[PDB]
Amino acid sequence: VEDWDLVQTLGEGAYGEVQLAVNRVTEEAVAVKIVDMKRCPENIKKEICINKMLNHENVVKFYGHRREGNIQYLFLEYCSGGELFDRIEPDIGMPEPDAQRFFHQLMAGVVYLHGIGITHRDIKPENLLLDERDNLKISDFGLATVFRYNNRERLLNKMCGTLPYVAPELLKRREFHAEPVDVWSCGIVLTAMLAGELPWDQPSDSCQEYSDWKEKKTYLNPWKKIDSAPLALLHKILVENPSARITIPDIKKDRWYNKPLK
Numbered sequence: 444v445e446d447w448d449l450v451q452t453l454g455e456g457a458y459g460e461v462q463l464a465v466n467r468v469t470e471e472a473v474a475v476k477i478v479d480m481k482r483c484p485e486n487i488k489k490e491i492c493i494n495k496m497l498n499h500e501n502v503v504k505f506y507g508h509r510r511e512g513n514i515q516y517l518f519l520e521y522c523s524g525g526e527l528f529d530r531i532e533p534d535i536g537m538p539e540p541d542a543q544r545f546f547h548q549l550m551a552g553v554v555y556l557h558g559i560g561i562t563h564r565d566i567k568p569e570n571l572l573l574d575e576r577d578n579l580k581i582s583d584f585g586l587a588t589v590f591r592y593n594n595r596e597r598l599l600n601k602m603c604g605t606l607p608y609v610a611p612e613l614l615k616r617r618e619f620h621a622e623p624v625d626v627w628s629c630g631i632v633l634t635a636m637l638a639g640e641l642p643w644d645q646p647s648d649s650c651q652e653y654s655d656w657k658e659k660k661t662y663l664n665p666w667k668k669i670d671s672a673p674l675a676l677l678h679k680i681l682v683e684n685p686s687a688r689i690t691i692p693d694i695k696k697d698r699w700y701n702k703p704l705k
């Protein structure tokens with residue numbers, strides 16, 4: 444019951460590759476991430492550490508790890524649904540009720556992380572997975588880190604993530620709060636699900652489409668495909684001042700978030 448077969452590649456990233464593994468006797472399917480420390484022994488130990496803490500229905504499950512010399516194995520829940528990236532149709536997105544359900548489950552997963560004192564740092568559709576029942580789970584904690592410990596919040600100074608998803612403070616400030624950055628990225632993921640495109644390459648004032656958003660020109664692409672209710676929330680998430688920006692408990696009170704659709 445503990446010997447597996449590497450059936451197929453699933454995601455060939457930088458650190459290595461996620462492979463599908465089927466057990467020979469039970470037929471049990473698991474996802475194994477293969478990280479070679481020779482071809483980083485630091486940011487791999489943090490991923491394992493963080494994973495062992497995590498237990499939640501919107502987070503991809505961690506089963507254990509084997510060491511086999513330098514080949515590190517990450518035994519993780521497999522999601523047969525794939526990446527949410529592949530459910531976004533380019534230039535159109537997806538039906539609004541689907542977007543709302545995936546956004547609820549994303550919020551739930553993120554409240555949980557923010558609750559355990561951890562921040563993901565790289566929320567995007569490629570890091571969001573659907574299982575068999577089409578429920579969304581947050582995957583890839585390779586950039587994740589602790590921002591509260593012993594009930595003391597620590598500010599971040601490392602720049603990381605993916606540029607079209609990254610919050611503007613992360614470019615501007617030397618130090619910043621973790622949670623607002625996560626919130627911002629979820630709001631980009633929403634734009635993605637509802638329009639089928641990203642609003643900008645980065646939120647820098649040297650980016651036209653971002654300047655157009657601060658100027659409230661919601662008469663252009665991205666925003667004119669959205670719809671006034673979900674757009675009203677995006678107005679509260681994609682705020683340049685991290686302190687003014689809506690928090691999660693307040694996203695849960697939002698008109699579109701509580702509108703029946705699905």
Ligand SMILES: COc1cc(-c2ccc3c(-c4nc5ccccc5[nH]4)n[nH]c3c2)ccc1O
Binds near residue numbers: 476502505583585
């Ligand atoms: C929860 O922590 C992690 C999860 C993953 C991870 C990445 C990908 C998958 C997959 C997966 N299922 C797929 C189906 C189709 C295409 C690609 C897929 N990747 N299932 N489970 C995963 C788990 C990787 C690193 C982590 O630190």
